[PDB]
Amino acid sequence: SALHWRAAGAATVLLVIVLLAGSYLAVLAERGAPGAQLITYPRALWWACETATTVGYXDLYPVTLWGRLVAVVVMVAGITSFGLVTAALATWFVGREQERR
């Protein structure tokens, strides 16, 4: 339909993808580093979620260079997405209420 509305949803599908590839890539990068805890897929997915939302509790975090780079991408994707939905809600509210005048 509307650009902003489409870009938002596209941002959401893209998010889910980054979340999954994030889980895969994180484990791939962290495994091999002594003491690393981001080493099994199920928890790595939960790590990805709390990173993308930025709640970073943490209970798990990358410690290798590539794990951190993967973390940086997930952070930005999550922030961009959640930020692309706010702009879509602002476009909807503005354009709309503009009629209520």
């Epitope: 895969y24 484990v27 003491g35």
Partner: antibody, heavy 118, light 106 residues
């Protein structure tokens, strides 16, 4: 159907080299890691290393000399471990096991008995 | 590298009794512990995963408990087929590691 198939035994002369194999069956996912565990007679289990076939990357135990090199062949679904410059010390039973990226070893191979003698 | 300690190394029990093996982690690992069985001339067999979760195809006789650094694998009423070597393994931190082992004797 036996999930992992390994040659029953291998003989190697000191200083020589042998390449063990492990053919897998059943379901196969991108999240599969194949591990190699070494067991000397009368003793316990010793993690040697791991490899992720879908990507081809492997990691090895730092607390021990690196006699092994891991490789994988996607087409024939076989994982190989190249043991080099052996000695009586490298003589034991080598297992391969599969892990679904969740931390435990679901299934093991029968194990390949390796002997280093002249 | 997490050090898993299993003591004692040999456990002797009377038929039908209740036996308990213990694993001691050198640092908190949650419940990221798993147990294996290896009979003579055999290969390891997963018995319990994640400290408590039961595996399919394993007698309801086998159970596990613990969290942090202290874990226990129990057998309610042990029997002959249980004579073997039990090992624990952690997946909390890299690299995975194995316990020294415990032999069950009747």
């Amino acid at each position: 159907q036996v999930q992992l198939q390994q040659p029953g035994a291998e003989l190697v002369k000191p200083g020589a080299s042998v390449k063990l194999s492990c053919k897998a069956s059943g379901y196969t996912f991108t999240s599969d890691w194949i591990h190699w565990v070494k067991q000397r007679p009368g003793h316990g289990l010793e993690w040697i290393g791991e490899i992720i076939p879908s990507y081809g990357r492997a990691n090895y135990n730092e607390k021990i000399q690196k006699k092994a090199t891991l490789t994988a062949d996607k087409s024939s679904s076989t994982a190989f471990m190249q043991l080099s410059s052996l000695t009586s010390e490298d003589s034991a039973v080598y297992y391969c096991a599969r892990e679904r990226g969740d931390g435990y070893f679901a299934v093991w191979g029968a194990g390949t008995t390796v002997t280093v003698s002249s | 590298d997490i050090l898993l300690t299993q003591s004692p190394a040999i456990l002797s029990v009377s038929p039908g009794e209740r036996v308990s093996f213990s694993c001691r982690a050198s640092q908190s690992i949650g419940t990221d512990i798993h147990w294996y069985q290896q009979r003579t001339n055999g290969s390891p067999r997963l018995l319990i995963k994640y400290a408590s979760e039961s595996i399919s195809g394993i007698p309801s006789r086998f159970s596990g408990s613990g969290s942090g650094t202290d874990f226990t694998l129990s057998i309610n009423s042990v029997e002959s087929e249980d004579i073997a070597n039990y090992y624990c393994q952690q997946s909390n931190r890299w690299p995975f590691t194995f316990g020294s082992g415990t032999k069950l004797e009747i």
